[PDB]
Amino acid sequence: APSRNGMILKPHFHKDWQRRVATWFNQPARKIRRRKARQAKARRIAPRPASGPLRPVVRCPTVRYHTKVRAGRGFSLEELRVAGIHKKVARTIGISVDPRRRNKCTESLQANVQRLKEYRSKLILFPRKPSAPKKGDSSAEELKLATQLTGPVMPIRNVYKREKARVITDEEKNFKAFASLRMARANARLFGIRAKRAKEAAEQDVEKKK
């Protein structure tokens, strides 16, 4: 029974919230259950980036979100034959392989290749055995470190480049940026209809001829 100005309210408690309520007095003991994993996993895999394997730079999808960047799932395949890394080797070398990405542009390809090129260079391949041959990095580059990378390997920060102030040529200063949007949005509006008339008018040039 409402009385004099409120909202409507469709609170959804007609069902049976009561039985299926989860309270959260786990929350802090869970925090700790978790702690001990983060903790244990690291001490188990001693020299290995604690965070996890290396994971690619990647762009967020839908239109609003565009300008952001992420750790993606894993680096593409096309990406690797280019960096010269075999896909099944990568998986052993702490390089994250999604094999399910349609690579569309050279911009985000080489951007993401440089991460592998970077990785190779600052990676100490700890050799199969102690008395081991090629590709494993030398006993100097080996003593120096026992270093787990705390935090995400080569963390991906959204970084922009400053544009210095300009002069504004009398040409940037003529472009009516509103007008040209309305143009755009009407040519894209009617591109299709306009094309039907060229198709009819091209029909009349043949139909007038016969």
Partner: protein
């Protein structure tokens, strides 16, 4: 807390702030937003006008990401960029005009509210207003589009 309630002050108080003529019975009206057409009408019609009925057109499955488009007013661009980049210029003598990626500060569209300081600018944005156009032009400086 319990202590600071009226129910404390309503002991020995028989009906309990609730009236002994018509008692506090369970659910006199109905249950919740119930009787909107019938008999609770006078609220709904005088206090929430335009509740009962359809209008408009479905857009069904709908996603906001598709039509994400924040707004900024000219009013405050001379915030977005560190105030020193304005004090630098307004001065400088070359007609520098700093660039303002209304993109980079987080806005898919720029709109013509407020004064703008007499100061040439390059605003790179998405969907400009007209008036935003005119004000920036009429100040000096330009309107660059971004995709």
């Amino acid at each position: 807390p319990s202590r600071l309630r009226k129910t404390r002050k309503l002991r020995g108080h028989v009906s309990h702030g609730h009236g002994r003529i018509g008692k506090h019975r369970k659910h006199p009206g109905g249950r919740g937003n119930a009787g909107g057409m019938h008999h609770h009408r006078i609220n709904f019609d005088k206090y929430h006008p335009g509740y009962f009925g359809k209008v408009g057109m479905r857009h069904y499955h709908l996603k906001r990401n598709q039509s994400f488009c924040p707004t900024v007013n000219l009013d405050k661009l001379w915030t977005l960029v560190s105030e020193q980049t304005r004090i630098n210029a307004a001065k400088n003598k070359t007609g520098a005009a700093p660039i303002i990626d209304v993109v980079r500060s987080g806005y898919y569209k720029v709109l013509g509210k407020g004064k703008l300081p007499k100061q040439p600018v390059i605003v790179k944005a998405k969907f400009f207003s007209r008036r935003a156009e005119e004000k920036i032009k009429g100040v000096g400086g330009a309107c660059v589009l971004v995709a």
